[PDB]
Design a protein around this ligand. Structure first.
Ligand SMILES: *[C@@H]1O[C@H](CO)[C@@H](O[C@@H]2O[C@H](CO)[C@@H](O)[C@H](O)[C@H]2NC(C)=O)[C@H](O)[C@H]1NC(C)=O
Lengths: 370, 511, 49
């Protein structure tokens, strides 16, 4: 009986999740849907650690699905540390604690439902390519991840026959007015009607208000930015303009029951494949109080087949880092009503964005020809 | 008000030393101390931290390393549990390879510097001996990637503003494999002779055995090694001349504890003059909130505060790392760890003692020795390069010109006797012509010796998208010149703009 | 003035006001980024005094 512990904290989602076990699509007669919908309201380190250890010691748990309601990556850090300690595949999916983290340790390879910075850079370049905006710049800060961003941009900017015109790459520092003078002079020298940036929320607000003071309005400067400055929606400050284009995960038309059923289907299919191709399942040593039980790390890695799972006619492969190979991204844009609505969709390297010609930000004339 | 400074140590002697140090620092509110021993399992240790170490939680926890050679799984859980509430962490002795990430670890302050500063010291040492060529090679995934990125951003930023060092070839291999003779021979086939390495202990022993098998010690191979490779497990099989580095006070836990309590007392005295103080709760269970004092306290600590202690001036860079450390330049003077000098800040200081180099040479070896056996590629073009089969004797039939002078044939070694249906390297086919005649005049004028082989694809070369991958690669002659398969192009090659980007075309031979 | 000086892009600028208004306009333009590299300001003797 494969133990599946689905933990939901913060909010209350008592819903028909039992449809996962009621589907009866488990071909291999060994992945018993032992679901444990334990709920709680105190998202404390000791609390969750004692909870997962007691749940693993009472029953025979081999897979830990997870969900939450806060926006703290420390929960994901604790989850990955527990995964490193007990060497069990865990799943933090579309709860708001997915919050993709990079350069993970040599733990039991687990993936979380969140796109990588490289995929966001790729979808932003596809957006820029769709509307023939072959000129831009780069304005990053000293936040961990800017180097990977600029390296991906450079690797995708000189491996194609498209005339991309990289104006200048900025590396600002939040030290004194020297950075202010630098960004002012550079944005006065940019003169490119597309701008990209990568920083946190408060730094984004600071940079946007400084640029608006220098004169970065929404007429020509159409700022683009990944989901790092967006964060939790419905909390838009006044510094953001009405032309910002941001990308993010499928937070609107992706149901939490759908997410948890996809996760449990992934777990069951991977376990079925591994137990059918190996004919031996490792022992779930439920100590979590003594490193002596860690000697069971001698069989083949379950992750090697877990990262190669597909079900329901949809590709659900994963990389060694722990991110989706097909994140199913969606494009978002804020209007003059200070509201973020969906515009386009990106899935399987295909952009189905509607709103053909740029719900444009008195010289804009159409022309008929034949 | 009282401030109970939490701590976690491995030995009771360190706990008594920390108690004495905080009692001394109390002379300058009040300060306290709490210490918990290390557990074999980090889960129960994390529970004890959440229950006992942060029972007051108003502090900056300090953590040490166990005698185990892990040094990562023991310091990571305290850092995670403290960064959950954005509580700063003090690090006495840790593997700072991965702990320099502000996204993984929110707040973390260390006492020992990472190997990035060791690569910086390597570069500073290189700036003295005028070594402008070096072939580095890393083994670990993250540590090696970090060291490579540090060396690359040091060498590239300095090159933008003589020729200036070029890292000729950056090699990488698995830290778990043992077959590296291929990479060793590939590095040997290059020009640089100043191999800088940054592997683990077992990897260092393996690469030392591989270099001893290939005999990379003939008084020309200069070695620059790190502190993680000068250990006894690798020193048992280490070659002479292996210049290494070692940090002072690497195992002195009491001095690190004294420095940490001093700097944290200075930080408390500096921050107590603030306006808002969000005291963390007396218990970690049920308190789901962010302490506003954490980030601001870390910012005002790392900004300018410093307390002189056992290591003198201690400045923190913008990563949570202590800068301006002390490095001892150690040389393997016949299995004797003699200190050639000391390092401090940005200046290198040699003790003017008997310093030698591997291979018994008492003089400073050169950076490289330029080869005189450069490969040359050539295409078959109608009146420039003739291609005729050779005779069965081994040479080919020699003829005379219209006047009676030799025709200056050269033994090409290109696959021109076969078709694309069955490509196979054939017997050398002697070649002659107008620009092979030009090639011999260039070789006598600058005294080099060359071989020649024709192209494999056949075309001159252009930019084309590959069939399967995404990156674009050159073709034929351009690809063989760029991808280290040819050092010159003696053939009719029209100078263009798409080719001058990566090639340095000389003045035109004929218009 | 910020939007206009960002839209001017001409390496010669003329103005006509008093001394304090000149200082105000110059500091505002320098905050917007009117440095001395390309923008070579010209002004009559009214702001010099
Ligand atoms: C791994 O390393 C060994 C030792 O370096 C290699 O063995 C050598 O074998 C080749 C034959 O292909 C000889 O030309 C070399 O002279 C040998 N080296 C020594 C030091 O004797 C071996 O080829 C490498 N690769 C594998 C797969 O074992």
């Amino acid at each position: 009986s494969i133990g599946i512990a689905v933990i939901l904290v913060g909010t209350s989602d008592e819903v028909a999740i039992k449809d996962a076990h009621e589907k009866d699509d488990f071909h291999h007669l060994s992945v018993v849907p032992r679901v444990e919908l334990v709920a709680m309201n105190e998202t404390d380190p000791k609390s969750i650690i004692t909870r997962i250890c007691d749940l693993m010691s009472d029953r025979k748990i081999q897979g830990v699905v997870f969900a939450d309601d806060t926006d703290q990556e420390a929960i994901a850090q604790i989850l990955d540390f527990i995964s490193a300690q007990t060497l069990t595949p865990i799943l933090g999916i579309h709860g708001g604690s997915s919050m993709i983290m990079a350069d993970k340790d040599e733990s039991s390879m687990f993936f979380q439902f969140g796109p990588s910075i490289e995929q966001q850079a790729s979808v932003m370049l596809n957006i820029m390519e769709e509307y023939d905006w072959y000129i831009f710049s780069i304005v990053t800060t000293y936040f961990p991840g800017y180097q990977d961003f600029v390296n991906k941009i450079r690797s995708t900017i000189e491996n194609s026959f498209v005339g991309w015109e990289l104006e200048e790459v900025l590396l600002l520092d939040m030290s004194l007015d020297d950075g202010d003078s630098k960004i002012q002079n550079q944005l006065k020298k940019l003169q490119s009607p597309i701008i990209l940036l990568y920083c946190t929320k408060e730094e984004a607000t600071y940079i946007f208000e400084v640029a608006n003071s220098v004169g970065l309005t929404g007429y020509g400067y159409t700022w683009i930015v990944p989901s790092l400055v967006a964060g939790d929606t419905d909390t838009v400050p006044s510094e953001f303009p009405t032309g910002l284009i941001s990308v993010s995960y499928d937070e609107w038309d992706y149901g939490l029951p759908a997410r948890v059923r996809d996760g449990i289907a992934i777990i069951t299919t991977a376990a079925s494949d591994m137990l059918s191709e190996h004919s031996f399942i490792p022992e779930p040593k439920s100590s979590c109080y003594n490193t002596h039980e860690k000697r069971i790390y001698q069989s083949n890695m379950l992750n090697r087949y877990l990262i190669n799972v597909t079900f329901e006619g949809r590709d659900l492969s994963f990389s060694e880092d722990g991110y989706q190979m097909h994140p199913k991204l969606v494009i978002i844009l804020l209007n003059k009503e200070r509201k973020w609505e969906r515009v386009g969709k990106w899935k399987d390297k295909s952009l189905q964005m509607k709103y053909y010609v740029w719900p444009r930000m008195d010289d804009h004339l159409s022309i008929v020809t034949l | 008000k009282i401030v109970n400074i939490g701590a976690v140590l491995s030995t009771r002697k360190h706990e008594q030393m920390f108690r004495e140090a905080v009692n001394q620092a109390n002379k300058r509110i009040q300060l306290q101390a709490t210490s918990v021993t290390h557990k074999p399992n980090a889960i129960q240790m994390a529970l004890s931290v959440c229950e006992d170490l942060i029972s007051s939680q108003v502090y900056a926890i300090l953590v040490s390393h166990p005698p185990t050679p892990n040094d990562h799984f023991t310091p990571t859980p305290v850092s995670y549990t403290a960064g959950f509430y954005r509580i700063p962490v003090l690090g006495l002795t840790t593997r700072m390879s991965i702990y320099s990430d502000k996204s993984i670890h929110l707040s973390f302050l260390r006492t020992v510097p990472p190997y990035s500063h060791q690569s910086s010291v390597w570069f500073e040492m290189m700036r003295v001996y005028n070594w402008n060529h070096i072939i580095l090679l890393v083994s670990d995934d993250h540590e090696g990637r970090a060291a490579q990125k540090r060396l690359e951003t040091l060498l590239e930023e300095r090159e933008s503003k003589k020729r200036g060092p070029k890292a000729e070839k950056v090699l990488q291999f698995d830290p778990g494999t043992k077959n590296v003779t291929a990479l060793l021979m590939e590095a040997r086939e290059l020009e640089a002779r100043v191999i800088i390495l940054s592997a683990s202990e077992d990897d260092a022993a393996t690469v030392y055995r591989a270099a001893a098998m290939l005999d990379m010690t003939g008084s020309g191979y200069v070695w620059l090694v790190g502190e993680r490779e000068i250990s006894g497990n690798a020193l048992r099989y280490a070659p002479d001349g292996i210049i290494g580095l070692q940090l002072i006070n690497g195992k002195n836990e009491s001095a690190h504890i004294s420095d940490a309590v001093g700097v944290v007392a200075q930080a408390v005295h500096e921050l107590l003059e603030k306006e808002n103080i969000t005291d963390p709760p007396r218990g970690c269970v049920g308190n789901t909130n962010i302490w506003k004092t954490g980030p601001l306290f870390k910012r005002v600590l790392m900004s300018s505060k410093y307390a002189d202690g056992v290591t003198g001036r201690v400045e923190f860079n913008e990563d949570g790392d202590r800068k301006f450390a002390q490095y001892s330049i150690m040389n393997l003077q016949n299995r004797k760890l003699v200190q050639v000098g000391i390092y401090n800040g940005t200046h290198v200081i040699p003790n003017d003692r008997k310093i030698i180099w591997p291979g018994g040479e008492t003089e400073k070896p050169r950076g490289y020795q330029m080869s005189t056996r450069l490969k040359i590629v050539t295409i078959h073009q109608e009146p420039f390069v003739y291609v005729k089969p050779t005779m069965s004797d081994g040479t080919c039939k020699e003829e005379f010109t219209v006047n009676g002078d030799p025709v200056k044939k050269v033994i090409c070694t290109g696959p021109n006797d076969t078709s694309p249906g069955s490509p196979r390297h054939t017997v050398p086919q002697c070649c002659y012509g107008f620009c092979i005649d030009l090639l011999i005049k260039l070789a006598r004028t600058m005294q080099f010796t060359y071989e020649v082989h024709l192209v494999a694809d056949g075309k001159f070369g252009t930019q084309e998208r590959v069939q399967n991958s995404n990156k674009k690669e050159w073709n034929g002659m351009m690809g063989e010149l760029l991808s280290g398969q040819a050092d010159m192009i003696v053939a009719p090659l029209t100078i263009n703009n798409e080719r001058a980007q990566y090639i340095e075309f000389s003045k035109p031979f004929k218009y």
